[PDB]
Nucleic acid binder design. Structure first.
Ligand code: MG
Ligand code: MG
Ligand code: MG
Ligand code: MG
Ligand code: MG
Lengths: 48, 209, 138, 164, 129
RNA sequence: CCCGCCGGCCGCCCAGGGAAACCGGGAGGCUCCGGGCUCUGGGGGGAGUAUGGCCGCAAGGCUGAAACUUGAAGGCAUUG
RNA sequence: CCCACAGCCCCCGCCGCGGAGCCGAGGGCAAGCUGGUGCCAGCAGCCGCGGUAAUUCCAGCUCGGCGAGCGUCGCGCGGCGCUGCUGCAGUUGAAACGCCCGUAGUUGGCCCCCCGCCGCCACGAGGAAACGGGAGCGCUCCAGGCAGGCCCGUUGGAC
């Protein structure tokens, strides 16, 4: 009835990803040097 | 097991009598066996690509009968391009048929220079036009380093054919992929059929083959 | 052919183009002037008015409001985008209203709506939706 | 009015007409990794310069060889390219210019020239030292990574005398 | 009524060449036609021809050799500045290496290559390749 | 009687053209896109409507908008 | 040091805060797993989603683009050969006046080698710069500006 009727997990406090070029360097090794299927469940299953 | 030639040309290719594909093309001999090319193209020099897959339906008494039509191109990036289509109840079988048909039909591509001559040819010999359905294409030679100014679909065909500089214009309903690919294929096919002042030389015919 | 092509025919081609360029709908809309006089915004990116009434194949009631432009005094209808944003809008309140994506034509399944609310009481609606700003002054 | 109104200004790069293109993204990321580019504006700058050179070369090439203007402008352009090290010394015909590539522009950046001399371990290390003013060109120290060295100045690059 | 004789002549020539003939007859001869044919002959496209005098707009007979690919005219003879030829070459010709464009100048009818050589301009008549 | 020429009315038709039906005495010689002249059209409704002007005994004819609305309307062909 | 005086830049000493946001993840268009809600609330430029797994709403995780900037609204150019001179269409999709005569207008076969005039092509004189192009110069680079070292074209600011 009340509008916004449709409208909390603790935030994963982890070290920030590097900023600037260092971020660019991360993806370069992420897709080539490091073993990857980008975004499927099985990849996320492995990382846990 | 082993490939048994079913044609005179096939048997001749089985033997070493014919040594190059240009020796077949120069007499307009049709190709009916996929082995006639792979024996001339053993290494992975050529490359296959799937362009578009479309589903077609036929209304019947109880529901529709569905099928798939596929389009495939092949080329070595050295003056050779092919294009074919196939249809079947299964997607993979249609892809195989399209690949076989693309391999079967192939044509050489003539390449030339823009203004200055130096090194190997890099662009089409002259202006080439093609037609299919409502789609017309224009290929204009470009200077070295100009890249390929074309849509993503046509650019793939140009890259496979082995052309690095060219200006393109498309007219008609270009969103119909098969007709655009056919238009560019026909334009490329016409290349070795235009007479130029360099080819005016009068050569006497040879009785052999 | 079907077009004049003589060497001394520039005048005829000029007048032909002048007459025939008026048949395009967009060109007429842009360079005729009727649209300019009819458009409530009078060619502005957005305007300022006052709220006077909160009102409502997809079957989804939408929340909107009636506005009266200050500089022009005419009445229009505006739509409140976000979820639960109607509460931030009170009767007899000053708002800033802009247009939709399409200039003039209606957007989406909303019938006869061409304006959007973006600021209320001097605070961005989207900012209030994310709690960046607050309306405790009102 | 103020004299500052007569100062000139201009942009220095061009953005692609089609933003999302997988091969282009891959190539740009590849180049950024090899040459340690901070962002994608440097690639656009390089493309801009290359386009300018290519257009000049085209316009000159459209004319006859024995044209006074053609000789003048071709000589100027070739001298500039040779001095900047983009084009090789042995090439003197205008045709060779049109085949140039942005990699040639990149290879003359300060980071690259110090890395090829073995004075730095990597492009990233080179950038880090450059920002810390530890390098010198001739008798002067330059702290701009994008600084372009000239062929006659390649052998005069060293480590800053005052650098610790 | 009849206006452009050269257009009719060129259309007839191309029509005959299409179906692999060997001789064509053009009805209304004229000096411009003769110079056009002379240039075509000099560049090796149409072998020889003859003019038959009848005291009334002489006829002419040409012999083909299956080399001509396309011929045409530009009806409203525009003026070409000496430095505005490359645009027309790009627009009209298949390539910058082969093909010819005919201009009439104060120095006479000549190919565009010759005009570029002398750095002069003029009016455009036609083209062939 | 048959062999022709000019003019006219028709049928089938190779090339060629076209989205195709089909045209081929052109709807050919055209993205390889320039013989000359005149007229008309620019998504569907509102609407051949309103207001003005001319004509007519009248019925009506010629000329001819805008606001607003809408996401498709249409052509040729295939299977049921 | 500079400055009318003060800053700011730059140089010399001592001590020493390293801080990323805005949009999005069905297609056009690069980027995917849990919990709520249940044609309601809402998203959606267009197609469309939502009536119990919602790949599209609301949230968490993860991921993508640009980046000290990102997004929204209106206008102009482009896209658009959908205003078409280059370069549209007019049997059936929108569109050849019912037909003839006819002024203005537009367009008009072939022919004389050398004279005059008009158009045309080339060159030249004359006439503001700034902007634009362009020769040369290491403001640390750059946007910029017309400078600098010494033995300087009479150094140069050409065109
Ligand atoms: Mg045309
Ligand atoms: Mg149209
Ligand atoms: Mg309409
Ligand atoms: Mg009808
Ligand atoms: Mg109709």
């Amino acid at each position: 009835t009340s509008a916004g009727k449709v409208r909390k997990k603790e935030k994963k406090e982890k070290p920030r990803p590097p900023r600037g070029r260092a971020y660019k360097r991360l993806l370069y090794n992420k897709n080539f040097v490091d073993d990857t299927r980008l975004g499927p469940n099985n990849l996320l299953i492995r990382q846990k | 097991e082993e490939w048994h030639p079913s044609t005179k040309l096939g048997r001749l290719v089985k033997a070493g009598k014919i040594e190059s594909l240009y020796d077949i093309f120069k007499y307009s001999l049709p190709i009916k066996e996929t082995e006639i090319i792979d024996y001339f193209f053993p290494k992975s020099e050529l490359a296959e690509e799937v362009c578009n897959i479309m589903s077609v339906q036929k209304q019947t008494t109880a529901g529709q009968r569905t099928r798939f039509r596929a389009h495939v191109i092949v080329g070595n990036r050295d003056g050779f391009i092919g294009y074919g289509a196939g249809v079947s109840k299964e997607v993979a079988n249609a892809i195989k048929k399209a690949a076989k048909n693309a391999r079967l039909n192939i044509v050489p591509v003539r390449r030339g220079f823009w203004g200055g001559k130096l090194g190997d040819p890099h662009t089409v010999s002259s202006k080439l036009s093609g037609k299919c359905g409502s789609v017309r294409v224009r290929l204009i030679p470009a200077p070295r380093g100009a890249g390929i100014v074309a849509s993503p679909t046509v650019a793939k065909v140009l890259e496979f054919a082995g052309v690095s500089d060219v200006f393109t214009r498309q007219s008609g309903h270009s969103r119909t992929l098969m007709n655009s690919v056919g238009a560019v294929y026909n334009a490329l096919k016409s290349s070795y059929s235009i007479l130029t002042p360099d080819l005016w030389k009068k050569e006497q015919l040879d009785h052999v083959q | 052919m079907s077009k004049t092509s003589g060497l001394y025919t520039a005048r005829k081609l000029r007048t032909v183009r002048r007459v025939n360029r008026w048949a395009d709908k967009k060109y007429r809309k842009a360079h005729l002037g009727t649209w300019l006089k009819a458009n409530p915004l009078e060619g502005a990116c957005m305007a300022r008015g006052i709220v006077t009434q909160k009102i409502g194949p997809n079957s989804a009631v939408r929340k909107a409001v009636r506005v009266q432009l200050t500089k022009n005094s005419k009445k229009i209808t505006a739509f409140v985008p976000r979820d639960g944003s109607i509460t931030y809008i009170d009767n007899n309140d000053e708002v800033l209203v802009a247009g939709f994506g399409r200039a003039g034509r209606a957007v989406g399944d909303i019938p006869g709506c061409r304006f959007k609310v973006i600021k209320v009481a001097g605070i961005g609606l989207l900012a209030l939706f994310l709690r960046k700003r607050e309306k405790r002054a009102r | 009015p103020r004299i500052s109104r007569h100062r000139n200004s201009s942009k220095t790069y061009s953005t692609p007409k089609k933003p999302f293109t997988k091969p282009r993204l891959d190539a740009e990321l590849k180049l950024c990794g090899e040459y340690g580019l901070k962002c994608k504006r440097e690639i656009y700058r390089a493309r801009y310069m290359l386009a300018k050179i290519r257009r000049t070369a085209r316009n000159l090439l459209t004319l006859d060889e024995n044209d006074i203007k053609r000789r003048f402008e071709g000589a100027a352009l070739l001298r500039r390219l040779h001095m900047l090290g983009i084009l090789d010394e042995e090439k003197d015909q205008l045709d060779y210019v049109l085949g140039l590539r942005i990699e040639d522009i990149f290879k003359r950046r300060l980071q690259s020239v110090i890395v090829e001399s073995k004075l730095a371990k990597s492009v990233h290390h080179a950038r880090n030292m450059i920002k810390a003013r530890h390098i010198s060109v001739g008798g002067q120290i330059v702290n701009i990574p994008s600084y372009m060295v000239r062929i006659s100045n390649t052998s005069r690059v060293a480590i800053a005398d005052t650098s610790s | 009524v009849r206006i452009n004789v050269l257009r009719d002549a060129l259309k007839s020539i191309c029509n005959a060449q299409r179906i692999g003939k060997k001789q064509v007859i053009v009805r209304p001869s004229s000096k411009v036609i003769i110079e056009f044919l002379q240039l075509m002959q000099k560049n090796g496209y149409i072998s020889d021809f003859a003019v038959v005098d009848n005291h009334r707009s002489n006829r002419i007979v040409v012999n083909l050799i299956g080399r001509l690919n396309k011929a045409g005219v530009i009806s409203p003879r525009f003026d070409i500045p000496a430095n505005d030829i490359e645009k027309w070459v790009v627009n009209l010709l298949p390539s910058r290496l082969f093909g010819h464009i005919i201009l009439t100048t104060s120095q006479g009818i000549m190919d565009h290559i010759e005009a570029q050589h002398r750095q002069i301009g003029g009016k455009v008549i036609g083209y062939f390749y």
